[PDB]
Design an enzyme around this catalytic site. Structure first.
Site, short mmCIF file in Angstrom:
data_model
loop_
_atom_site.label_atom_id
_atom_site.label_comp_id
_atom_site.label_asym_id
_atom_site.label_seq_id
_atom_site.Cartn_x
_atom_site.Cartn_y
_atom_site.Cartn_z
N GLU A 88 1.16 -1.26 0.33
CA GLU A 88 -0.13 -0.34 -0.06
C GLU A 88 0.86 1.73 0.00
O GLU A 88 0.49 2.39 -0.13
CB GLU A 88 -0.80 -0.03 1.28
CG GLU A 88 -1.67 -0.70 1.25
CD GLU A 88 -2.87 -1.27 0.19
OE1 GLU A 88 -3.00 -0.24 -0.42
OE2 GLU A 88 -3.81 -2.07 0.55
N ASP B 85 -6.80 6.17 -4.73
CA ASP B 85 -6.62 5.18 -5.00
C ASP B 85 -5.92 4.33 -6.97
O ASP B 85 -6.40 5.56 -7.23
CB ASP B 85 -6.45 3.90 -4.24
CG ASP B 85 -8.00 3.35 -4.39
OD1 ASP B 85 -8.76 3.73 -5.56
OD2 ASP B 85 -8.64 2.43 -3.80
N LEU C 156 -8.90 3.47 2.61
CA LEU C 156 -10.33 4.82 2.01
C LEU C 156 -10.86 5.48 2.51
O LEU C 156 -11.67 4.55 3.95
CB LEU C 156 -11.21 3.17 1.88
CG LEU C 156 -12.13 3.88 0.25
CD1 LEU C 156 -11.36 4.89 -0.23
CD2 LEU C 156 -12.74 2.33 0.43
N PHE D 296 -8.44 -6.52 3.36
CA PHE D 296 -7.73 -5.28 3.28
C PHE D 296 -7.91 -4.64 2.09
O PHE D 296 -8.52 -3.53 2.04
CB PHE D 296 -6.31 -5.27 3.59
CG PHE D 296 -5.80 -4.27 4.24
CD1 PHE D 296 -5.39 -3.69 2.96
CD2 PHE D 296 -5.82 -3.62 5.63
CE1 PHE D 296 -4.85 -1.82 3.62
CE2 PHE D 296 -5.44 -2.52 6.33
CZ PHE D 296 -5.02 -1.80 5.08
N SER E 180 -11.75 -20.97 -5.01
CA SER E 180 -10.47 -20.67 -4.87
C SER E 180 -10.39 -20.64 -2.83
O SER E 180 -9.64 -21.33 -2.91
CB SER E 180 -10.05 -19.36 -4.54
OG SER E 180 -10.22 -18.44 -6.36
N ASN F 125 -6.42 -20.58 -10.31
CA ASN F 125 -7.69 -19.96 -10.11
C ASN F 125 -7.23 -18.44 -9.45
O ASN F 125 -8.18 -18.04 -10.25
CB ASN F 125 -8.73 -20.69 -9.15
CG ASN F 125 -10.04 -20.46 -8.85
OD1 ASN F 125 -10.45 -19.90 -8.61
ND2 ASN F 125 -10.49 -20.96 -9.95
C1 LIG Z 1 -10.40 -14.78 -0.74
C2 LIG Z 1 -9.84 -15.47 -0.57
C3 LIG Z 1 -9.26 -15.82 -2.09
C4 LIG Z 1 -8.66 -15.77 0.30
C5 LIG Z 1 -9.17 -15.51 1.66
C6 LIG Z 1 -8.95 -17.30 1.99
C7 LIG Z 1 -9.05 -17.44 3.57
C8 LIG Z 1 -9.72 -15.81 4.52
C9 LIG Z 1 -10.27 -14.82 3.23
C10 LIG Z 1 -9.36 -14.58 2.62
#
Ligand SMILES: CC(C)Cc1ccccc1
Ligand SMILES: [Cl-]
Ligand SMILES: [Cl-]
Length: 162
Positions: free
Chosen positions: A11, A20, A32, A104, A117, A132
């Site tokens: 960031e 941004d 933000l 974040f 994913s 993916n």
């Molecule tokens: C949204 C996935 C790809 C990444 C993620 C995994 C577990 C908790 C928060 C984020």
């Protein structure tokens, strides 16, 4: 390396209101302020967040304070999310940091469309998940950052950040 350092790299740190990558008024370490196109709306939100009349400018300490709150909130957001929590809890510490970085950056909602994913990460199929994750607007819009986070999930090391 840790989550704070990681995000501070991704960031940057800016002490004056800026726009941004998406064109949104932000300040500090990726905080933000608003999606509204009005700079006044942004300055108002800033003043409210800092608790003083900042006039669009803050100190390093104030930036760090916002950052601390934002990181805490992201984690707390993951833990409160039924879809996210179980995946996050299955991960090792390094990979947890990659998960926090994504929330974040894009919010809980931003990562809503990441079902496949999530499942792959949950199953520890790292390479597949990596593939993916790259099929996303996220990756196409901020490719250098996405590659670092993706390598992190793929490898479970901080290599992309050294
Ligand atoms: C949204 C996935 C790809 C990444 C993620 C995994 C577990 C908790 C928060 C984020
Ligand atoms: Cl705030
Ligand atoms: Cl990028």
């Amino acid at each position: 390396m840790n989550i704070f350092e990681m995000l501070r790299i991704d960031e940057g740190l800016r002490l004056k209101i800026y726009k941004d990558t998406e064109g949104y008024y932000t300040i500090g370490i990726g905080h933000l302020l608003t999606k509204s196109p009005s700079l006044n709306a942004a300055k108002s939100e800033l003043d409210k967040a800092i608790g003083r009349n900042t006039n669009g400018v803050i100190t390093k300490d104030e930036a760090e304070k916002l950052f601390n709150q934002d990181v805490d909130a992201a984690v707390r957001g993951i833990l409160r999310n039924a879809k996210l929590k179980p995946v996050y809890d299955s991960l090792d510490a390094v990979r947890r940091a990659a998960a926090i970085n994504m929330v974040f950056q894009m919010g809980e909602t931003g990562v809503a469309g990441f079902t496949n994913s999530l499942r792959m990460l949950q199953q520890k199929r790292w390479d597949e998940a990596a593939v993916n994750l790259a099929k996303s607007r996220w990756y196409n819009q901020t490719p250098n950052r996405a590659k670092r986070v993706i390598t992190t999930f793929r490898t479970g090391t901080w290599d992309a950040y050294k």
